[PDB]
Enzyme design. Sequence first.
Site, short mmCIF file in Angstrom:
data_model
loop_
_atom_site.label_atom_id
_atom_site.label_comp_id
_atom_site.label_asym_id
_atom_site.label_seq_id
_atom_site.Cartn_x
_atom_site.Cartn_y
_atom_site.Cartn_z
CG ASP A 1 66.13 56.74 7.24
OD1 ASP A 1 66.75 57.05 8.28
OD2 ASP A 1 64.92 56.44 7.21
CB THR A 2 71.88 56.93 9.38
OG1 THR A 2 71.21 57.99 10.11
CG2 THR A 2 72.77 57.56 8.32
N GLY A 3 68.73 55.85 10.04
CA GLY A 3 67.90 55.19 11.04
C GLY A 3 67.17 53.97 10.49
#
Lengths: 99, 99
Positions: B25-27
């Site tokens: 999850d890059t967020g």
Amino acid sequence: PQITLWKRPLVTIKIGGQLKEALLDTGADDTVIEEMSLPGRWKPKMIGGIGGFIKVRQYDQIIIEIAGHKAIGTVVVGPTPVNIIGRNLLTQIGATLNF
Amino acid sequence: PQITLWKRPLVTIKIGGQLKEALLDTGADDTVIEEMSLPGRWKPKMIGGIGGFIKVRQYDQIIIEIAGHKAIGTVVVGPTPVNIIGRNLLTQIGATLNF
Ligand SMILES: COc1ccc(S(=O)(=O)N(CC(C)C)C[C@@H](O)[C@H](Cc2ccccc2)NC(=O)O[C@H]2CO[C@H]3O[C@@H]4OCC[C@@H]4[C@H]32)cc1
Ligand SMILES: [Cl-]
Ligand SMILES: [Cl-]
Ligand SMILES: [Cl-]
Ligand SMILES: [Cl-]
Ligand SMILES: [Cl-]
Ligand code: NA
Ligand code: NA
């Protein structure tokens, strides 16, 4: 571009003629944008994050530029803590996760 | 590997000797795992996202194997609706976003 993740992957977007900052977010199915005006009708949607659900307004076929790449797709508007570019528009700009 | 984003970027992880599925999850600034026990000291933290905040327990120097790649760092544990691998460990396995 190739974006490392030592910092938040924030990019500039353009929507409704306005420039905004947004997080490229592989963990988000949907694109979620802070309160703003968009054209046309909207339909209701409930999205759920870490700390529960929020109601949002769903607008489809919205034109948006993301880091200079044109996309046209659904955007939902509501009380998000940050503008989030989710997988529905990351796929349109050809983004992949690589390691 | 190169992961396209048509579907959720779910991978198998091993943490505390258990196997789990988690979202790359890059967020996410942090790595957030559903309730489990982990060895060592911990301190309470609040983390927030869509919906609001949740209280979690922060453990330092935890090793996680992420789709076969070992990485070590802080992991926070609490009532998250999904297991999330955040940037603090994605950087360690050399993950990048590419378009
Ligand atoms: C400090 O470190 C942190 C702080 C915050 C978070 S987070 O989980 O709240 N979030 C941060 C972001 C919202 C600013 C990471 C996101 O990737 C979450 C990660 C996430 C995924 C699922 C459930 C909870 C969280 N995704 C998310 O909320 O997606 C929303 C919007 O689209 C939908 O797709 C997702 O799948 C359907 C529901 C969610 C909806 C993680 C680590
Ligand atoms: Cl940052
Ligand atoms: Cl940009
Ligand atoms: Cl779409
Ligand atoms: Cl860390
Ligand atoms: Cl690097
Ligand atoms: Na429309
Ligand atoms: Na520790």
